[PDB]
Amino acid sequence: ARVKRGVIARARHKKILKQAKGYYGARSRVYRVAFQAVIKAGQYAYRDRRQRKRQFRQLWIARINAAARQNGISYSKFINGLKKASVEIDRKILADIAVFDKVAFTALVEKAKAALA
Amino acid sequence: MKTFTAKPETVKRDWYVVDATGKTLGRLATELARRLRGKHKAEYTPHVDTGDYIIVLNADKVAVTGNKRTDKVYYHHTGHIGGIKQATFEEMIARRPERVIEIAVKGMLPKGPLGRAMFRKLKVYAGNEHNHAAQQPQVLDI
Amino acid sequence: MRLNTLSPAEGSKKAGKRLGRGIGSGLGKTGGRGHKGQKSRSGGGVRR
Amino acid sequence: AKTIKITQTRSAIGRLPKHKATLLGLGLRRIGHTVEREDTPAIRGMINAVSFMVKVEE
Amino acid sequence: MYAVFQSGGKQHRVSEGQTVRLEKLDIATGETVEFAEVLMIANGEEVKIGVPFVDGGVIKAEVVAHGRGEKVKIVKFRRRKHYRKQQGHRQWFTDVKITGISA
RNA sequence: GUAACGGGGCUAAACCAUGCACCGAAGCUGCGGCAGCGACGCGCGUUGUUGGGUAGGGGAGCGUUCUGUAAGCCUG
Ligand SMILES: [Mg+2]
Ligand SMILES: [Mg+2]
Ligand SMILES: [Mg+2]
Ligand SMILES: [Mg+2]
Ligand SMILES: [Mg+2]
Ligand SMILES: [Mg+2]
Ligand SMILES: [Mg+2]
Ligand SMILES: [Mg+2]
Ligand SMILES: [Mg+2]
Ligand SMILES: [Mg+2]
Ligand SMILES: [Mg+2]
Ligand SMILES: [Mg+2]
Ligand SMILES: [Mg+2]
Ligand SMILES: [Mg+2]
Ligand SMILES: [Mg+2]
Ligand SMILES: [Mg+2]
Ligand SMILES: [Mg+2]
Ligand SMILES: [Mg+2]
Ligand SMILES: [Mg+2]
Ligand SMILES: [Mg+2]
Ligand SMILES: [Mg+2]
Ligand SMILES: [Mg+2]
Ligand SMILES: [Mg+2]
Ligand SMILES: [Mg+2]
Ligand SMILES: [Mg+2]
Ligand SMILES: [Mg+2]
Ligand SMILES: [Mg+2]
Ligand SMILES: [Mg+2]
Ligand SMILES: [Mg+2]
Ligand SMILES: [Mg+2]
Ligand SMILES: [Mg+2]
Ligand SMILES: [Mg+2]
Ligand SMILES: [Mg+2]
Ligand SMILES: [Mg+2]
Ligand SMILES: [Mg+2]
Ligand SMILES: [Mg+2]
Ligand SMILES: [Mg+2]
Ligand SMILES: [Mg+2]
Ligand SMILES: [Mg+2]
């Protein structure tokens, strides 16, 4: 019972070279270079599912800082006064109100300043 | 529902004029770079330019503290072997007073294609007059 | 009962060991032999 | 008998092997974990041994 | 008009007639769900901030579909150490439609 | 080639003492899902806990060629 490798070996190489579409030069044409490129792209993707959650909270805070100083208070004091008033709204929703409703955001700043009174 | 992102075809920028007479160099510089980048707006976007245009007047009346007026030194190399040069704070106010303000501001901005474009919005003059009355600049007390 | 309906008792036909067939199998590369000895060579070892 | 709250406030990585055995006899498993032990001179003896990384609410 | 409610460990702000994707809920595909807690309701210069909830506010929704999200791939590699491993994942969700909010 | 603050710059944006905030990790918590071990009761439920890994040991699988089932089944 002799086994020939041709049909199976071709299907396994065609699978890797399809995941390497759009890469530069030999990284999308040659199996040896493309297999290395596919493994690195999977390492980075695992790492960047963690950094995506850091990069967005950093953007939300910098926008709440800008909108609060237009009302006469800094970020670190604005957050402290909201916890003293038992407001549970998080950074993502706060950074959405600041851009789309300037009047509702102002009402929140006045709630915080009365807590620190 | 994704977060808002500013588009570079709908941004609104304003014009301001600031007087730099008797003001500390590095404390006036930090405020200018905050507004050239757009950090003072709730629409701030790290990959989009949302800053303002600023005109700086009286660039040769800026102030420093200590013995910095004669002790501070500026260095640069010309690219030829043994081509290290230097000048002091006295010497560059006498020669070209505008370079002092924008050397400080250029070091407080990001490095890259976008940081080079934020620098085009800064206009620095050595005297008390400018020629941008058509743009109608406003007064800013930094 | 047909010729395609008879099966062996459970536990009586454990499969063998195959060395050097990739990372996943657990016996790839060195094939359970370690690193660079007399006992890692072909036809290698000491007498009784 | 009288019982007390014990909580763990620091990590066990890099500690003496005799310290790790004191947290095993107390029952603590991770940071912020809380247990309910009885107040006897032998329990307080091994609270005193790892007090730098343990908080007690009586 | 819009309101903010909490569901599935996250928070959402919605308006009547929208469709929101949430974590999986154990409710049939035609039923009606209410969200009792409401963090804030804004109605055009009439803003109510809850401390922590708005007293008497309710949000009404309707379950539209259940499904699984796109497949992600997990790759684990360790150079020169003879190690590698891979996995796959699809995440469940539930879509609801906002029908009425009233305080 | 500045070149013994990472740089800009700083007379505090330096050091000392005291206080209250805030930022900050794949740590902890919240929500959804998967697997291992042990208990309690009838494969099932309730329940507690565990799941970084080289050398190496243990367990369960995918696919390829050939023989029977097959004078069967699919196919101009
Ligand atoms: Mg043959
Ligand atoms: Mg072949
Ligand atoms: Mg194949
Ligand atoms: Mg081929
Ligand atoms: Mg292959
Ligand atoms: Mg090529
Ligand atoms: Mg190509
Ligand atoms: Mg091609
Ligand atoms: Mg090849
Ligand atoms: Mg972060
Ligand atoms: Mg020369
Ligand atoms: Mg010389
Ligand atoms: Mg330069
Ligand atoms: Mg510079
Ligand atoms: Mg950088
Ligand atoms: Mg620049
Ligand atoms: Mg330029
Ligand atoms: Mg191994
Ligand atoms: Mg070898
Ligand atoms: Mg072996
Ligand atoms: Mg060895
Ligand atoms: Mg040797
Ligand atoms: Mg050996
Ligand atoms: Mg050999
Ligand atoms: Mg240590
Ligand atoms: Mg020299
Ligand atoms: Mg530093
Ligand atoms: Mg420099
Ligand atoms: Mg001081
Ligand atoms: Mg001070
Ligand atoms: Mg001080
Ligand atoms: Mg200090
Ligand atoms: Mg202190
Ligand atoms: Mg985190
Ligand atoms: Mg964890
Ligand atoms: Mg849960
Ligand atoms: Mg869970
Ligand atoms: Mg493992
Ligand atoms: Mg036949």
From Swiss-Prot, chain A:
Gene3D superfamilies: 6.10.160.10, Ribosomal protein L20. It comes from the Bacteria. InterPro entries: Ribosomal_bL20 (IPR005813), RIBOSOMAL_L20_CS (IPR049946), Ribosomal_protein_bL20_C (IPR035566). GO terms for biological process: ribosomal large subunit assembly; translation. GO terms for cellular component: ribonucleoprotein complex; ribosome. GO terms for molecular function: rRNA binding; structural constituent of ribosome. Keywords: Ribonucleoprotein, Ribosomal protein, RNA-binding, rRNA-binding. The keyword Repeat does not apply. SUPFAM superfamilies: Ribosomal protein L20 (SSF74731). The keyword Cytoplasm does not apply. Binds directly to 23S ribosomal RNA and is necessary for the in vitro assembly process of the 50S ribosomal subunit. It is not involved in the protein synthesizing functions of that subunit. Belongs to the bacterial ribosomal protein bL20 family. This is Large ribosomal subunit protein bL20. It comes from Escherichia coli O45:K1 (strain S88 / ExPEC).
